[PDB]
Amino acid sequence: MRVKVNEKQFDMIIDKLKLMVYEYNTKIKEYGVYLKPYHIVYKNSKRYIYIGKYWYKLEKIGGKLKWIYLGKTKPIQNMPNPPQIPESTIIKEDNEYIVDE
DNA sequence: ATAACAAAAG
DNA sequence: CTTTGTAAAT
């Protein structure tokens, strides 16, 4: 079920997916909420990667950016819908990606 | 105004 | 072995 794939090649797939989220974020820029293109979680020399998955409200207070987690579903009804990203596991280890397909 | 973590929950 | 929060680079 799981696939280990070299870095430069799967980065092409990753950058395509992140591009969809960049373009979506410009479309909803006046809704005030942020769909994070690329989220990394670190454990045990692995990086777990979640593309276009988690919504935040960004506030800037006192110079400093603040991240308010909103969730996985789009936070305002009737706003444009986020792009279909594959949900599947992405793990970076040792300049390679473990992926599902 | 997009790119290094922890712990809880799954 | 994902979900929910915390906090330089472009």
Residue numbers in the entry: 4 to 104
Share the article's original sentences.
UBP is a highly abundant protein, and we reveal that it plays a role akin to bacterial nucleoid-associated proteins with over 300 binding sites on the Sulfolobus chromosome. Taken together, our data provide evidence that UBP functions as a general nucleoid-associated protein that plays a key role in facilitating the egress of the MCM replicative helicase from DNA replication origins.
Next, we solved the structure of UBP bound to DNA containing a ucm site to 1.8 Å resolution. Significantly, and in contrast to the homodimeric free protein, UBP binds DNA as a monomer. The interaction with DNA is principally via the major groove and is mediated by two sets of beta-hairpins within the structure, one corresponding to the stirrup loops in the free protein and the other being a part of the 5-beta-strand sheet to which the C-terminal beta strand contributes. Of the three lysine residues in the stirrup loop, K63 makes base-specific contacts in the protein-DNA co-crystal structure. The DNA structure remains close to standard B-form but with a widening of the minor groove to 8 Å at the center of the molecule. Notably, the beta-strand that undergoes the intermonomer strand swap in the DNA-free dimer is now observed to fold back to form an analogous interaction in cis. Furthermore, the interprotomer Y100—F13 π-stacking interaction switches from an offset sandwich orientation in the dimer to a T-shaped interaction in the snapped-back cis configuration of the C-terminal beta strand in the DNA-bound monomer. In contrast to IHF and Fis, although a modest widening of the minor groove is seen, UBP does not introduce any discernible bending of DNA in our protein-DNA co-crystal structure. However, our demonstration that UBP binds the ucm as a monomer suggests this is not the case.
